[PDB]
Amino acid sequence: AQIFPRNANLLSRLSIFALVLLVVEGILILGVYFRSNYFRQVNVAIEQPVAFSH
Amino acid sequence: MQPEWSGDPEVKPVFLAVTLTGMVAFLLMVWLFAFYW
């Protein structure tokens, strides 16, 4: 009450919760990026110089 | 000695929320690292 508003309690608890969620989300994004199809070039039809069709 | 929050409507709800968050995180992590391939 001296230097903080009433909602500071909720703000601090939500900040901790959001920080944990953000760490988990960052880990998830890193893993997904490193396991993505764009990274590993999967299901991407690479264009060929002579356009051969199997 | 009772916990400071003892006798509060919000205690069960907050515990529940924390558990649900945790379960969701766990399942998602498990999927990405084990089943997504």
Partner: peptide
């Protein structure tokens, strides 16, 4: 508050599903 925790969890879940779909797009 539990309501805000659940709302944040739902937002994080939606973001995680979008990211997961983006990987296999």
């Amino acid at each position: 508050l539990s309501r805000l925790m659940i709302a944040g969890l739902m937002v994080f879940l939606v973001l995680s599903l979008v990211v997961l779909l983006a990987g296999r797009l």
